[model samples]
Target chain A: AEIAAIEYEQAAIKEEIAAIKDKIAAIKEYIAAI
Target chain B: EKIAAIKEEQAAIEEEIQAIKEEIAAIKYLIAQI
Candidate 1:
């Protein structure tokens, strides 16, 4: 039961991290273009 | 000046993102061990 909770938490964190990374990448590309 | 500032901001964000990912990985490892 606890393990399942951890799994869900980990998944959510991973999703958030991915989204942040995507935003950073977009900003990086924009900087490069300027 | 603006580009330099953006680069600095990007580096900070990257550091934070890595820290978050590290925590996620640690939790995953702990879950596996449990």
Candidate 2:
């Protein structure tokens, strides 16, 4: 059961990191567009 | 247990990452608004 929680947390971390990277890209794009 | 301690550490890291993501998103919105 503990391992399951760990795995779930890991999966969420992966998704969050992916979203963060996308946001970073958006900022970069906007800065360059200006 | 040692695993439980590791879980706490991971959770702390997770919270920080979430905050980082939130900040990035805020920056993204402001950039677009400008």
Candidate 3:
């Protein structure tokens, strides 16, 4: 039961990581735009 | 406003900041298992 799409889980984690990166980008832009 | 770099950012960012921070914390926990 635990063998389901482990890479997919990593991908999902990467996706979350990407989202955090995007948020950081927004923060940087917000910082720069000010 | 000099406090918390308000002029560079906004309170609207609070949501994204909180979410990203939480996700980062969660991801760190997940990776800690490895």
Candidate 4:
């Protein structure tokens, strides 16, 4: 029920956060390479 | 050329940053409601 939804939402948020972190690192690397 | 691309990428990152912030707020609200 609500618990499942909350868990799923939390998982999604964590995934997005991890992705953004990787993107940030890549962007920094790109800037440094230029 | 490169500068424009860099600026565009930066803008996109900023938008994602803002979106992440909003999602965080939503998570907080959802947690509080539970």
Q: Tell me, by DockQ, which candidate is best.
A: 2
Per-residue C-alpha lDDT of model 1 across residues A1-34, encoded as one tens digit per residue: 6555655665676677788667656654655565
Write candidate 2's Cα lDDT for A1-34 as tens digits: 9777876777687787778778777777877687
lDDT of 1 by residue, B1-34 (tens): 6456555655765787777677557555655655
lDDT of each: 0.63, 0.75, 0.56, 0.63
Q: How large is the C-alpha RMSD of every model relative to the true structure?
A: 19.9, 3.6, 19.7, 19.7
Instruction: Name the runs in model 3 displaced over 4 angstroms.
Output: B1-34
lDDT of residue A20 for candidate 3:
73
lDDT of 2: 0.75
Candidate 2 residue lDDT tens string, B1-34: 7578667767877787887768777777877787
**Counting only residues 3 or more apart in sequence or on different chains, how many pairs clash (N, Cα, C under 3 Å) in candidate 2?**
0
- DockQ-derived CAPRI band for the predicted complex in model 2: acceptable
**Alpha-carbon runs more than 4 Å astray in model 1:** B1-16, B19-34
Worst 10 residues of 1 chain A by lDDT: A25-34
Question: In candidate 4, which residue ranges exceed 4 Å CA deviation?
Answer: A1-34
Query: Which consecutive 10 residues in model 3 chain A have the weakest lDDT in total?
Result: A1-10
Candidate 2 segments whose C-alpha is farther than 4 A from its true place: B1-34
